[PDB]
Symmetry: C5
Subunit: 312 residues, 5 copies
């Protein structure tokens, strides 16, 4: 079969709508998420029109093989979606209403700069390619767009699911392409990380500062403190970066871990300095420890104040 003829020289618009049923498997490392939703299309094929009075039927349903149906494709997807046609109902005037349920693995990049205080805008791009008989354009039926109430992305807050009404039509390989942009905005729930990374870092800084209260003569103890806290800092750094894709930039968590490492390494340099001035000039070492015991936790407290105040 072939596309319906134009009543003049006008483009055929397909009213689209997506209703999210299930939303799962948001992969930060793969920058993909799995979706299972309704796809609804609606166009006008006057060849299928009929008299509502002579025909005692009010709708009349067809099978996908019976009538022409537009080839609608997703762009930012890994494999072609798995779709099951739910219903096809033509109107007495020829208005075809098509409804399927599909599942797909969507590939949408994420911006981890404000991670884990980041919000994302996942994109689902519909697209249709014009035929030689007629140009096809996509539209948005807001009545057919939405998401179920029990849709959940564990670890995220789902903000909204909308669509950009004005489609992007463009030339591609000598044919017209019409693209729609469905947008799922979310905001990450950072609490999980506060006890996953932020607490080990803060407690490691505190543990490193405890060394300033040990006697300056007991070198091995303070050495254990400093060294173990520095290595612990490095381990937390790598471990934390192992959850993200190979992004080139640095996240907010990256900055917090970096400042913590600065404090711990500062405690190391301090321990080395004091140990260097212990035999000769014991007054200097005593002053260094005495001042550090007040400055370190103070600067650290101010830092946490500015940080959590900023990212919350």
């Amino acid at each position: 079969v072939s596309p319906p003829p134009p009543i003049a020289d006008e483009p055929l618009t397909v009213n689209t709508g997506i209703y999210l049923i299930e939303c799962y498997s948001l992969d930060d490392k793969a920058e993909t998420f799995k979706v299972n939703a309704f796809l609804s299309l609606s166009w006008k094929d006057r060849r299928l029109a009929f008299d509502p009075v002579r025909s005692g039927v009010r709708v009349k349903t067809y099978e996908p093989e019976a009538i022409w149906i537009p080839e609608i494709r997703f762009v930012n997807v890994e494999n072609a979606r798995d779709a099951d046609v739910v219903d096809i109902s033509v109107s007495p005037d020829g208005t075809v209403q098509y409804l399927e349920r599909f599942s797909a693995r969507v590939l949408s990049p994420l911006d981890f700069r404000r991670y884990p205080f980041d919000s994302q805008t996942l994109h689902i791009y519909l697209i249709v390619r014009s035929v030689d008989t007629r140009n096809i354009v996509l539209a948005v039926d807001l009545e057919k767009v939405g998401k179920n109430d029990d849709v959940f992305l564990t670890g995220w807050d789902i903000e909204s699911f909308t669509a950009v009404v004005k489609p992007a039509n463009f030339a591609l390989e000598d044919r017209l392409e019409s693209k729609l942009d469905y947008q799922l905005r979310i905001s990450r729930q950072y609490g999980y990380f506060v006890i996953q990374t932020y607490l080990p870092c803060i407690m490691t800084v505190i543990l490193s500062q405890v060394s300033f209260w040990l006697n300056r003569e007991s070198v091995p103890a303070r050495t254990v403190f400093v060294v173990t806290t520095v290595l612990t800092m490095t381990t937390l750094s790598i471990s934390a970066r192992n959850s993200l894709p190979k992004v080139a930039y640095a996240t907010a968590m990256d900055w917090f871990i970096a400042v913590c490492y600065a404090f711990v390494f500062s405690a190391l340099i301090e321990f080395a300095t004091v140990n260097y001035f212990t035999k000769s000039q014991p007054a200097r070492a005593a002053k260094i420890d005495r001042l550090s015991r007040i400055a370190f936790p103070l600067l650290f407290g101010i830092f946490n104040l500015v940080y959590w105040a900023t990212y919350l």
Copy 2:
């Protein structure tokens, strides 16, 4: 083909039933589990009635392609289930009895607040969408609901598998939808975790208390004890939280590990205090150790008493 005509203006009810055959792959992190069971439907299509005398057959079986069959779908599923039709038998009055065997990956959220002493209610949602010719409603055939005796969840105890008789009918994209809620209740077997996390934590607290009995002059020894116990606590915490999804709340295990970390870090602060009072005021330090050796294991024992008494 199209749905059977209403004998007046009455909804077509489809009597459903699920019989769990196999139950496996309950993923705590993905909050999904794989199910393999029987799906049984039963309705009345008077068009299929027949004379039991003229027709020498008492039942008569059809092929799925021959007669109208309702489109029954699962909601909380990742992909459309894989089903093999087992049998289709019509009654002389037109009562179609349909039986298939399906396997599906069900997506059901979990509540880890009482983890690992938690009980869960896995949900399997049936749903059918009404056609324009007639509304379809779902029902539950208690005779067709159940589960095999050899159904096992390697880490769980299976409590029961029932279904909510009253379906949830609602409007979706201008059509009526009927949803049924099958519930599989389970309770986790916590023993695995007692030796996976709880024992390492308790033994780390005890090991941390062993430092109080070492001579106050041998500083490096007590330093090794305290530091290693604190780092061990941090590692056990992270490792333990790595088994769950990025939930925002805290589990019971989270509380136990948190209190253990409180005891260990308290032992650290104690070591720092005593080391600070060792040269000047040795009597004070001696009092500190003497009291700690009795308070720490006592408060810890009381805590374990309240905790294990509460969560069991």
Copy 3:
């Protein structure tokens, strides 16, 4: 097509047989294994009989779509098997011999109580559901049961592949079901674990005992020994249990690791005691070390004797 008519009122028996061709991917954690074997069925459909003299052919082969074939299904399998029909040959009397080659992921629970000295009985459950025209029963053709010589389960010794002749017939959803039990018995090869887990534990106990021979005055050294051996014990314990499913009970390896941890922690308590009696009553501490140096390795040797003697 429909099932062959009963020559009176007798059940139709299908002679079954499985020939293991390939056996791989035995997953201890998933309690599943992958199989690839021959499935052979044989029944009597007198409608297919023919004259061996008038018909110059001795066998005559059909296509699956041509004749009725019983719907045979596996029970303890995750998805429907992937089968390729190999041959279908009818006899002059109507004896259909059907042969396919299938691969399936079988789900069979394991008993890790004697792990890693455990033996298992993997189960493959065949089943057939009776039709309304005739009851179908399963049988076992010992001539068609077996396994290839080059079948290997890396890390296991394959003992036998047999079948329980008497099938389990029972009522299910108002129809008769016939179940057969094929059993693949295997015994694990424990050597891999002796150098994977048992050696690290034994060597850790020895290393812990080495501290008793260090001078009682060098406290930090003995502290390092004891602490590192205890942490090593915990790490080996958790690491070892990470290979099994979340079973509630304890394995033999669990017992060995537990006794090792008891010896190491006992060495810790000993170090604390001696360090506590070093200044006052040095004779007591000296006696403690002197006795431990002989008692610890002796009790440990006896333990290994009873253990390896028992589980070997």
Copy 4:
């Protein structure tokens, strides 16, 4: 159907083109990447010519099963691509223009010698096998080659996507084969590794040098420093090499880690030497530390200068 007849004795050329739509899952360890793009073919089958006036259509489109289509296969692919035919348009002269959208897992080796400062040229090899009736040759339609602007490799910069016009024709199993070479050039974004590995190594070298400023009499402290830095170096080496395939050569990161290990182990040998000359010849040890404190960081700075200057 069979290939179109040659208008004389000429090979049939198929004008090919790939338009990258999606590019993802570039696996360094598997040396594979997943691609999703348009494949466009174009040939001349005069048997399909038609009158544009008698036939009221100006192009008129067919189904894949209707007309002869050349068997085009990818070479460096793991499984046969999953393709959905988008359009087939014939011209009045018989010019078939074919368009599909495919996804495939391409297998292209990588050169990690300059890793992570490496650039790669991923290859996609098309091929067609000539039939006995006519030889088939592949060509490149530059109008049909390109890639979408929103194509992204989460860890790479995409340089260009071109194709080698002149195909490689050769004999294979007594038939002619024509191969085309599409090339996607990329350059890795190394920043991720600077904070993933390079910083831990640099900070570990610095931390190892901090030991030279500790008193020569406090042996245990310097021991802790040296040992922990050496073990940290080894762990970072192994961990770093765990990201690449089992390549036989050494990467640039391998060289950086190797020099760092040389500096750290050199600090170990230095500590051993000084500790050996501390009691006898204290002036010598003092000279050793005094010189090392200036030589080590200087040679390290020069090394970093030459290295980062070279690889950037």
Copy 5:
């Protein structure tokens, strides 16, 4: 359709040949590898002969459904291969030449005794089952066997790809089976492991020997050295064995790691002995250190000489 009739009473031989196109994903742990190659068959079905003069065609091509084709199966494969028929050309005398392109996951056991200096012989087993009308036997057409030059196993050197000409015929379930053995011999590239495991082990032995040059009075330092090197050895052992399947035997790497562990633990026993003889009989301890400093690195050098000389 049915097999071609025998011109007398002779077996039908099918000339087979495999041409490796792609070879990848050699999994040492799973003992499987993925292959993608050409499969070429050639037999004689006299029913298809034709006159080359009356028929104006020189070859004439058929569809798989048109003519009888032998059921060729792989044995040591996990799932049935995915094959796409490339060409079918019959000769005027009836010689059918069949060509497909397949991909399959081959399962072949490996011998890790000489690992990582091991060479393997991967097996691909063809097999055909004789029908009741005629016995079928497999043969090898050397013209159709080979492999592309750009075939690579990222961690191996590919030696050759040949086939055993004489097939293995045997009885199976009352029918004749013919099996062919294609052999791909390879030799592992061990360099990756020299810097992955061998270097950490050697440097850890050296690090353990460094303790002999430290003063006998600084007990804690030597304790740190010995303990850390022993634990490092154990970790390298387990980590190394984690790359192989649960084999019961020991590899060459296993032996090297074992000897290294013997040297390190010997250094531990030495430190304990000297520490035991430090106060009383200091001359004995001094002699122990003096001799060890020369014997240990010498015995280690001799060992490395014999080892690397043997396995290379």
